[PDB]
């Protein structure tokens, strides 16, 4: 599951040979990229769409932690870290989107939405690796505003209720990849994400 996106199932990642290959440099750009749309769909469903049963998330973290401290099997430690790192990148992507959508606690309710609360549980149980991965995620968001990279976009309102936030998130995450054959708003919004 986690190492999906790599290898070929149904997408232009598959059939990258002569049929989708005009001299070798076509594959070079098609390679060096690993799919994560399928991975993101699994993560978003497990964090957002599912209920507060909080048993599948514990079950997933139980086996990841168990293999992260396995020594008697040769080479198991290295593949456990690579699996963990890719999974934590997916959770950070969902957490950034969810937190950016929702507004600040202006009503002094002192309540954090359940989907975000599940994201924090993953980060805490994997503290050394989550801290490392959140460092790179933050760097990707603020690098365009360090220079004039722009992509101005347009201002948008901030959702106050949970239901509105779950609306926007699923539009961009429940998506099928592909088959085979105003500037100041963007800077301020990226700075808010950082």
């Amino acid at each position: 599951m986690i190492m999906f996106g790599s290898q070929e199932n149904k997408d232009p990642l598959s059939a990258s040979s002569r049929i989708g290959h005009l001299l070798p440099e076509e594959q070079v750009y098609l390679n060096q990229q690993s799919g994560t749309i399928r991975l993101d769909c699994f993560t978003h469903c497990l964090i957002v769409k599912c209920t507060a049963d909080i048993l599948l998330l514990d079950t997933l973290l139980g086996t990841l932690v168990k293999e992260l401290q396995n020594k008697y099997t040769p080479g198991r430690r290295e593949e456990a870290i690579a699996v963990t790192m890719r999974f934590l990148r997916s959770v950070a992507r969902v957490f950034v989107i969810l937190s950016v959508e929702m507004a600040s606690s202006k009503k002094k309710n002192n309540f954090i939405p359940q989907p975000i609360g599940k994201c924090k549980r993953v980060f805490q149980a994997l503290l050394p690796y989550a801290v490392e991965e959140l460092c790179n995620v933050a760097e990707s968001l603020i690098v365009p505003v360090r220079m004039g990279i722009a992509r101005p976009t347009a201002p948008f309102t901030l959702a106050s209720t949970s239901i509105d936030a779950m609306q926007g998130s699923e539009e961009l995450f429940s998506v099928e990849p592909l088959p085979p054959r105003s500037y100041l708003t963007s800077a301020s919004s990226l700075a808010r994400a950082y």
Partner: protein, 93 residues
């Protein structure tokens, strides 16, 4: 950061910030951003005028984030709001 910021030039200022370069419970944080232990009080005192406009113009957007240092150094404008609303909630109770 001992020297008072005097040059009004972006190029010179960026040069200065660059060229100047057991039980687990005993672990203690060690902020030393590019040398020297840094306290928030020192930075707040250094950027004083820049933080007066910030808390007076960007009050509805940057002064609304969780744990923002724009709203607990705020003046009357932020003070007249939370007291009256808190009083009104008590009055209707």
């Amino acid at each position: 950061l001992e020297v008072l910021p005097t040059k009004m030039s972006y190029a010179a200022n960026l040069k200065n910030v660059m060229n100047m370069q057991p039980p687990l419970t005993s672990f203690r944080p060690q902020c030393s951003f590019m040398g020297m232990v840094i306290s928030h009080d020192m930075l707040l005192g250094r950027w004083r005028l820049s933080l007066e406009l910030f808390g007076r113009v960007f009050m509805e957007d940057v002064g609304a984030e969780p744990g923002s240092i724009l709203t607990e150094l705020g003046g009357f404008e932020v003070k007249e709001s939370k007291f009256r609303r808190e009083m009104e909630k008590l009055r209707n109770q």
